[PDB]
Design a binder for this molecule. Structure first.
Ligand SMILES: [Zn+2]
Length: 409
């Protein structure tokens, strides 16, 4: 019985569960952000429930507005954050709302990110969310874990981004469909929580239901620290998979021979190695995202840039910390100013002037190296623009030379 299965078993209140089995599980936290909030509320009452189940288990996002204020006020909803905590998923675990062995549901597709914390985390539609708000439970078709056992040491200039991009590259946009992608092995236990978030975030890009990574005391340290800092403290159990569990499509990845890659334009899953496509000129580099937007990413990228002393002219470098906290960390550490001084522009996620700038919008015939999730046509701009995906290191290197690279050159 897998970790996702022990989670769904404890949640449903069953003592055993199989893949394909269908259960009613209790929700630990539910999150709504933009359109889905108003939708969920209206959809919530044309039905007639006047009380949400647990006003402290719902997390909402703010900046028509009126229904949402009045909803949070009419309910007892304690956790509601402004959009200047950052547009990404970072906020939810940052404040300690995601603990191991928990069932987390959210409006956004990439809620799967929180699987990094050893919780079962999924995006759901508006109606499902309305049910959750009403009953604090939801139906789940119990998935199957496909286990990716990653062992070996990451070579220099190689990040979990290259790892997950390679994995996606051999499994295609599908899949990994009705199934949960579970990452493990020594290479996974060695990487940081940030690095794990990078992978779990991109799980659904394989068409996966969610990514999940088993917890260890990096996970514990993170969660406990966040909980004490934000007063979101609450007991949790550490649910981890048994060797008594079986997996559709166990893969084996060895991080030794993984080298810096690219997700080449319009599709995430093609994934050609850096050397092959190297040399093509680029007019923009986008560093930071929900995928790699955290402190370690900024740190390695600015390290690369700094060592070679600045960026190529006639290239637009855009640096976007995943959240306000991450931004403040990078600020306090001098990283933000190093970026600024080298000619990059940094978007302060709490600044509307920063957030509304069109400076990073790709025009026709423009090439961009991005550290984000998605390279499909028209994503960052014109549909006649193309987008390569990379780790912060590879991206930084591209910003240094001003065309497509392999970080070691
Ligand atoms: Zn600003």
């Amino acid at each position: 019985m897998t970790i996702v299965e022990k989670i769904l078993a404890k949640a449903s209140g069953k003592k055993e569960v199989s893949p394909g089995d269908i259960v009613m599980a209790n929700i630990d936290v539910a999150m709504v952000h933009d359109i889905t909030g108003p939708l969920t509320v209206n959809t919530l009452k044309e039905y007639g429930i006047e009380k949400v189940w647990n006003p402290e288990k719902i997390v909402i996002l703010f900046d028509n507005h009126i229904l949402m204020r009045k909803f949070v006020k009419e309910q007892g909803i304690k956790y509601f954050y402004d959009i200047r905590e950052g547009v990404c998923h970072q906020v939810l675990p940052e404040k300690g709302h995601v603990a191991p062995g928990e069932v987390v549901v959210g409006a956004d597709s990439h809620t799967c990110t929180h699987g990094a914390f050893g919780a079962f985390a999924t995006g759901i539609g508006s109606t499902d969310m309305a049910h959750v708000f009403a009953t604090g439970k939801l139906w789940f078709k119990v998935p199957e874990t496909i286990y990716f056992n990653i062992t070996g040491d990451l070579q220099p200039y190689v990040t979990s981004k290259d790892v997950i991009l390679s994995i996606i590259g051999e499994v295609g946009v599908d899949g990994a469909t009705y199934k949960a992608c579970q990452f493990g092995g020594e290479t996974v236990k060695k990487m940081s929580i940030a690095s794990r978030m990078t992978m779990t975030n991109m799980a659904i890009e394989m068409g996966g239901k969610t990514g999940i990574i088993e917890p260890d005391e990096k996970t514990i340290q993170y969660v406990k620290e966040a909980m004490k800092k934000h007063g979101t403290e609450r007991p949790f159990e550490v649910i981890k998979g048994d060797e008594d569990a079986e997996f559709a499509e166990v893969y084996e990845i060895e991080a030794d021979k993984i080298e810096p890659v690219f997700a080449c334009p319009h599709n995430v899953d093609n994934v050609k190695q850096a050397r092959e496509v190297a040399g093509k000129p680029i007019d923009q580099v986008f560093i930071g995202s929900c995928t790699n937007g955290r402190l370690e990413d900024l740190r390695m990228a600015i390290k690369i840039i700094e060592k070679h002393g600045g960026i190529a002219d006639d290239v637009r470098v855009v640096v976007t910390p995943a959240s306000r906290e991450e931004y403040l960390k990078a600020l306090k550490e001098g990283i933000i100013e190093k970026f600024l001084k080298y000619g990059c522009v940094v978007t302060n996620p709490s600044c509307s002037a920063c957030m509304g700038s069109l400076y990073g919008v790709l025009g026709p015939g423009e090439v961009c190296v991005s550290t984000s999730n998605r390279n499909f046509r028209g994503r960052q701009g014109s549909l006649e623009a193309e987008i390569y995906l990379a780790s912060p290191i590879t991206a930084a290197a591209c910003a240094v030379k001003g065309e497509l690279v392999d970080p070691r050159d």
